[PDB]
Design a protein around this ligand. Structure first.
Ligand SMILES: C=C(CCO)c1ncnc2[nH]c(C)cc12
Length: 167
């Protein structure tokens, strides 16, 4: 039993809700919140900009030190950093950005990072400003993630389409 509330169950291990991931993280304080990161951990917009804003820019400060030490992530890769006031940990995961020409096949590799964590609060990878089809992202999530994932979908209209079209 966990503290996630109001989710629709899609499969044995995948759950979904129309919610603002920032507000959901602040309420649940999950062990792991997933950020829709880029390789530079520049949290300017989309989910990343919103999560970083909610940390009063502390996520960005920590991220800049991480990059200065380690260099950029790989597309499809991840790193674990602090969750600040939102979660114990933040798993920064880089899905391919279609608006940069990156290979959508890397979306499966991106979701594989979730399997290193027993339970996660997450957005749909590569959705939103990353330019992928969210219906496809949900399919890859369900077919790749084996651990317990609670998906927050900000847009109510998109949430309803994802549920109604889910096979
Ligand atoms: C990709 C999106 C935008 C939906 O079109 C998203 N997904 C999950 N949580 C979110 N929180 C905010 C503030 C945007 C957001």
């Amino acid at each position: 039993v966990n503290s996630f509330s109001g989710y629709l169950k899609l499969t044995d291990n995948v759950y979904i809700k129309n919610a603002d991931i920032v507000e959901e993280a602040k309420k649940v304080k999950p062990t792991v919140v997933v950020n829709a990161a880029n390789v530079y951990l520049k949290h300017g917009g989309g989910v990343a900009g919103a999560l970083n804003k909610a940390t009063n820019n502390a996520m960005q400060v920590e991220s800049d030190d991480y990059i200065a030490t380690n260099g950029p992530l790989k597309v499809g890769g991840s790193c674990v950093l602090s969750g600040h006031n939102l979660a114990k940990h933040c798993l920064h995961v880089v899905g391919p950005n279609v608006n940069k020409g990156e290979d959508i096949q890397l979306l499966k590799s991106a979701y594989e990072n979730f399997n290193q964590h027993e339970v996660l609060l997450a957005p749909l990878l590569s959705a939103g400003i990353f330019g992928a089809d969210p219906i496809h992202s949900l399919r890859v999530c369900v077919d790749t993630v084996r651990t317990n994932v609670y998906l927050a979908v900000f847009d109510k209209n998109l949430y309803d389409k994802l549920v109604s079209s889910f096979l």
